Amino acid sequence: XASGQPSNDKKNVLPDWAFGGFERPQGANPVISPIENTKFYCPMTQDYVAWESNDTFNPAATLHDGKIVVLYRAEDKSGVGIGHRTSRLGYATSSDGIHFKREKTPVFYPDNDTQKKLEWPGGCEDPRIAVTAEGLYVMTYTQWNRHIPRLAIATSRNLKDWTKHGPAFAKAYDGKFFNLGCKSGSILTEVVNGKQVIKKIDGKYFMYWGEEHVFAATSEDLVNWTPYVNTDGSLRKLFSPRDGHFDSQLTECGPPAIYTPKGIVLLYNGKNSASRGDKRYTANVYAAGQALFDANDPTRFITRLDEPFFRPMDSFEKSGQYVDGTVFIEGMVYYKDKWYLYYGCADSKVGMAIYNPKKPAAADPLPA
Ligand SMILES: OC[C@H]1O[C@@H](O)[C@@H](O)[C@@H](O)[C@@H]1O
Ligand SMILES: OC[C@H]1O[C@H](O)[C@@H](O)[C@@H](O)[C@@H]1O
């Protein structure tokens, strides 16, 4: 029989620099689920497809015209396995971050355009959105053609009319990384006069990126990015998965990075290795971490959380299309003086949670 002693409890204490806890609002989640009946005339297919009928997940989030806007990854029924459908982005708006008005057709999708060899048939996956102080939204996303996933950039002033600029790493180093399999780009931002905007460091834009390791890149124009490289020209690893912890197979960038008085915070997704990971957590689960970098030297790693701050807790987080579970963190909005987090739930649903700095919740508990 348990005795309920405090010193044996499952608290998960955060360092002072870390965001959280993020509390799921009672009864709210999932906030975006598939809809069977909504059809789209696909300009590639030349017929109507049920574009959000399978799974709706891995979302971007931003602020526009006084509302939270989410662009959600939506998959059709054009194939069975993971990565075998076509991904297109849905559009939804909310004044409370919980109840959304969705558009019935997608806003971003593969088309008869400059990117068709890179985006057909897999489409456009896993967006992250940040905005300049001058009002240009910058989207990082994955192009998927069933051969190589590529990290790419699109821009817009209104979140509807998007210009595709192609792979982020197309141009640098005489095209060395054009064919690099890559994804998950977190541009550096800062809250200025209450609004989260893209932030320059040393006169250039900055992005953390990657799935298997955390890498970095700079840009002068927000579309052509130059990775940081080692002496021999290989990609320079800022940090990597580690034995014994939740972030043991992958350390995959999450939402845009945030410049704070303690340093730059990168919120990211860890995948737990069955062989090398933390056996207190489910093998192969994705659970979220945070890393701190030097404010004056953005590639200089300081520390990371030892335990995830947010992990699968509800049924639709614990299992779904991705059977081993995810809380795949990807969007954040500073809104009404709180932080609204948007995440994929097991590659199937969209969830949200709120960190209120004035009334902070606990982090998700240890299993342990
Ligand atoms: O990018 C191609 C595919 O890569 C897989 O590992 C998953 O991330 C899929 O959701 C994606 O469709
Ligand atoms: O399938 C789990 C997970 O795989 C990748 O590592 C991610 O980039 C996401 O696309 C997806 O949510």
Author numbering: 17 to 384
Wording from the paper:
Residues 17–384 (the first 16 residues is a cleaved signal peptide, and residue 383 is the C-terminal Pro) were built into the 1.35 Å electron density map. The pocket houses two mannose residues (the crystal structure of BT3780 was obtained in the presence of mannose), and its location corresponds to the active site of BF0772 and thus fulfills the same function in the B. thetaiotaomicron enzyme. In the −1 subsite (active site); however, the mannose (Man1) is in a B2,5/OS2 conformation, typical of the geometry adopted by the oxocarbenium ion transition state in β-mannanases and β-mannosidases. O1 of Man1 makes polar contacts with the side chains of Glu227, Glu268, and Tyr302; O2 interacts with Asp142 and Glu227; O3 forms a hydrogen bond with Asp142 and Asn74; O4 also makes a polar contact with Asn74, and Asp363 forms bidentate interactions with O4 and O6.
The enzyme, BT3780, which lacks the canonical phosphate-binding basic residues, is up-regulated by the dominant human gut bacterium Bacteroides thetaiotaomicron in response to yeast mannan. BT3780 is encoded by a polysaccharide utilization locus (PUL) inthe B. thetaiotaomicron genome that orchestrates the depolymerization of yeast mannan. Thus, the enzyme does not mediate phosphorolysis or reverse phosphorolysis reactions and therefore is not a glycoside phosphorylase.
